[PDB]
């Protein structure tokens, strides 16, 4: 046992030394030689109403028009952002929903929470009403996040410190991801869907392989649990958000932090993080009731999206990048442009 | 300017809004309470008796008493980082806490069961998300306590205890120790009750506590109290 522990410590030291040896230059030094972006002004265009409870999760559609939001009242609402009209209202069998997902094709949606079960609903039934298609049971903890890989399979995250890939038609998880010391909080899919990353309460982010089912890479440096994670538009990097009031940008190739986004006066945690279409701007939600836009290449603050009366829990940018939607615990969802 | 199909979509959205409003109005009239405690503390017995009077995850129990609807949530089976989902219960009307009175001389793999129960009660009561949430405490194993106290002294659990070994004094000491864990007595109050094989009084006590909490909340809303 002692020999194995010493070997593990030596391997960790070697990995740290290898990572340090290649830190020849920093992103900030190189990016100092470009003109910064000016003050970003965003005015709310639509204020979606109809939810009578806290908003916890939301996902933008591929068409960049339809979006789905989850609330604690047990109702899933599909909103037409262009006209604000409600498309569907799905009553959840369990009101304790903590996450929701929208399929790339828009045929099915997913949700889950403290019930430890992920439910799939069909939006294109010949019956004309939205009904649950399959239920993905087997997790020993509350569902944290879920994302649709394709019409056939879905990847979900749970609080039992493990993530699994579920085959909708089969109903049985085909791959199980293990290695996280803390509860897994968020998931993000790469643009090519080849790889995905997950954040856990152990303040570390891990890189997983869809088919191999093994952790290729690990990330560390956060001083608190990670709650948000999102891939860079290029797909070679991602950013994470924790409760220590700092956002860290991690790139898959360097296996080290590139730049840190934080402000002295902010002492609250970070709920959600998202990237612009081109990746030039970084948007993160904070518990102080407003969203802050961060200069990705310079870490300078670009603007503030204020107006929410409660904690900002979720946000997302459209596929085309035309507008960004933000959710909050006051039951109101706003779209900014 | 809107087309016929757009007008139909608007009408459908308005109908959905009306349905959501009706559902919210229906749901706002049900009292939501949270139940906490250890598996052997008597949670199962309490749930069974209340259900009679009227797999992994959380158990939902519905019961009605005096034309008032109650919703009970059990999170005992959900062993995980509770502070990551405890905030989901901010709107809980009241919290039900169950502790076994006879577990003072038993051991758990804190070392003592009662010390762990007191620590859990202290953590839940002082939680930042339960500033104005009242707490109800139920003692489920007083009948076994009657026999156990007459043989095993209470000094094992509380070395500082120096009062008489009589049943009433021990029960009063336990109640006072449990109550003293409150730091915000002005903002919130604790309701204590003793449970046994008899179950008629438990529901009445719960209803009275819920009514008092609702009355106090409405007084706060009106500005009084």
């Amino acid at each position: 046992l002692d020999q194995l522990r010493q070997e593990a410590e030596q391997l960790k030291n070697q990995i740290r030394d290898a990572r340090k040896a290649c830190a020849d230059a920093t992103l900030s030094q190189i990016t100092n030689n470009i003109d910064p972006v000016g003050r970003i002004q965003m005015r709310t265009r639509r204020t979606l109403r109809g939810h009578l409870a806290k908003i916890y999760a939301m996902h933008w559609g591929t068409d960049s028009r339809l979006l789905v939001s989850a609330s604690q009242d047990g109702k899933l609402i599909i909103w037409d952002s262009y006209t604000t009209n409600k498309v569907h209202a799905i009553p959840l069998r369990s009101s304790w929903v903590m996450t929701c997902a929208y399929a790339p094709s828009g045929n099915y949606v997913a949700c889950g929470g403290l019930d430890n079960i992920c439910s799939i609903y069909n939006l294109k039934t010949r019956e004309g009403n939205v009904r649950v298609s399959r239920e993905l049971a087997g997790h020993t903890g509350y569902l944290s996040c879920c994302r649709f890989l394709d019409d056939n399979q879905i990847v979900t995250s749970s609080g039992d410190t493990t993530c699994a890939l579920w085959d909708i038609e089969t109903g049985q998880q085909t791959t199980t991801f293990t290695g996280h010391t803390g509860d897994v909080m968020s998931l993000s899919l790469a643009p090519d869907t080849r790889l995905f990353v997950s954040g856990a309460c152990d303040a570390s982010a891990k890189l997983w392989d869809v088919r191999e089912g093994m952790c290729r890479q690990t990330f560390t440096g956060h001083e608190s649990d990670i709650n948000a994670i999102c891939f860079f538009p290029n797909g070679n990097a991602f950013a994470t958000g924790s409760d220590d009031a700092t956002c860290r940008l991690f790139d898959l190739r360097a296996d080290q932090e590139l730049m840190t986004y934080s402000h002295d006066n902010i002492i609250c945690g970070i709920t959600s993080v998202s990237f612009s279409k081109s990746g030039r701007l970084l948007l993160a939600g904070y518990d102080d009731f407003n969203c802050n836009v961060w200069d990705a290449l310079k870490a300078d603050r670009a603007g503030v999206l204020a107006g929410h009366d409660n904690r900002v829990s979720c946000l997302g940018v459209t596929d085309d990048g035309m507008a960004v939607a933000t959710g909050s615990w006051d039951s109101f969802l706003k779209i900014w442009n | 300017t809107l087309s016929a199909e757009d007008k139909a979509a608007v009408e459908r959205s308005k109908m959905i809004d009306r349905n959501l409003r009706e559902d919210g109005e229906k749901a706002a009239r049900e009292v939501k309470l949270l139940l906490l405690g250890a598996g052997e503390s008597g949670k199962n017995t309490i749930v069974k008796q209340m259900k009679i009077i009227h797999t992994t995850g959380i158990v939902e129990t519905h019961f009605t008493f005096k034309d008032l609807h109650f919703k009970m949530f059990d999170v005992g089976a959900q062993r995980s980082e509770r502070k990551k989902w405890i905030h989901c219960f901010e709107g809980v009307t009241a919290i039900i806490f169950c502790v076994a009175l006879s577990d003072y001389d038993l051991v758990l793999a804190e070392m003592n069961r009662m010390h762990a129960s007191m620590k859990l009660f202290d953590s839940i009561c002082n939680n930042k998300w339960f500033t104005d949430t009242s707490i109800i405490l139920f003692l489920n194993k007083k009948d076994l306590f009657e026999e156990k106290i007459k043989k095993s002294p209470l000094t094992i659990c509380y070395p500082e205890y120096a009062g008489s070994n009589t049943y009433e004094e021990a029960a009063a000491y336990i109640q006072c120790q449990f109550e003293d864990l409150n730091k915000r007595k002005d903002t919130k109050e604790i309701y204590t009750h003793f449970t046994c094989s008899t179950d008629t009084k438990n529901v009445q006590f719960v209803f009275d506590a819920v009514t008092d909490v609702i009355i106090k909340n409405n007084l706060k809303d009106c500005g009084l109290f």
Partner: single-chain antibody, 231 residues
């Protein structure tokens, strides 16, 4: 999903009849209903429409006031109180489903219908009435409207319906080239503003029928003359 209309037969001009349609296999409450007439050897013509919840009702100019329509969600039955009758009222009545939301496909399902015998608006026209052609060869059908169907929202309200012999009309394309569910990829629609055309990659024995072009930009709904394919 099935619709069974009831009522019909010989009715005197001075009499009255009440038609009933039974809806099953779908959420009738959330689906709007339409009535379409089809006189012998004639084209289709919209009659009335009811939105979900009976909040909106429309009638054609030739039937306004005369005809009363009612809805009964609990029983999933649709009624048509047909108070007065003239000679021209003789025609087959078809019940059509309709649901209106983003991405929806209204007029997707058409009921079997019933036969009843009795003892400004946008003009839709189709130049071609009969287009004989052998199987396999591509066939094109063109329809035109007197007013542009392109709304400011960026979509054109045009529909294509195919009625095979002894069968009710079946939706093919809606607003205005999207393929209806359950239809082969052979059919394709195109157009611009006012000129539209329906093209088939290869004709099969199952494609024999009459094609109707319908507009939904504004009420009352108008149906084209109809083009028949034969071999």
């Amino acid at each position: 999903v099935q619709l069974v209309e009831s009522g019909g037969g010989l009715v005197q001009p001075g009499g009255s009849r009440k038609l009933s349609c039974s809806a099953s296999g779908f959420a009738f409450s959330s689906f709007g209903m339409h009535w379409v007439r089809q006189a012998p050897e004639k084209g289709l013509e919209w009659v009335a429409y009811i939105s979900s919840g009976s909040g909106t009702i429309y009638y054609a100019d030739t039937v306004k006031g005369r005809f009363t329509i009612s809805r009964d969600d609990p029983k999933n039955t649709l009624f048509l109180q047909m108070t007065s009758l003239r000679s021209e009222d003789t025609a087959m009545y078809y019940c059509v489903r309709s649901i209106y939301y983003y991405g929806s496909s209204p007029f997707d399902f058409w009921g079997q219908g019933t036969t009843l015998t009795v003892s400004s608006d946008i003009v839709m026209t189709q130049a071609t009435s009969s287009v004989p052609v052998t199987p396999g060869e591509s066939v094109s059908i063109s329809c035109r409207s007197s007013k542009s169907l392109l709304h400011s929202n960026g979509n054109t309200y045009l529909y294509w319906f195919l009625q095979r012999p002894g069968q009710s009309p079946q939706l093919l394309i809606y607003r205005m080239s999207n393929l209806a569910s359950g239809v082969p990829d052979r059919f394709s629609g195109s157009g611009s503003g006012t000129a539209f055309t329906l093209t088939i990659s290869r004709l099969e024995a199952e494609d024999v029928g009459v094609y109707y072009c319908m507009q939904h930009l504004e009420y009352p709904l108008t149906f084209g003359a109809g083009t028949k394919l034969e071999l």
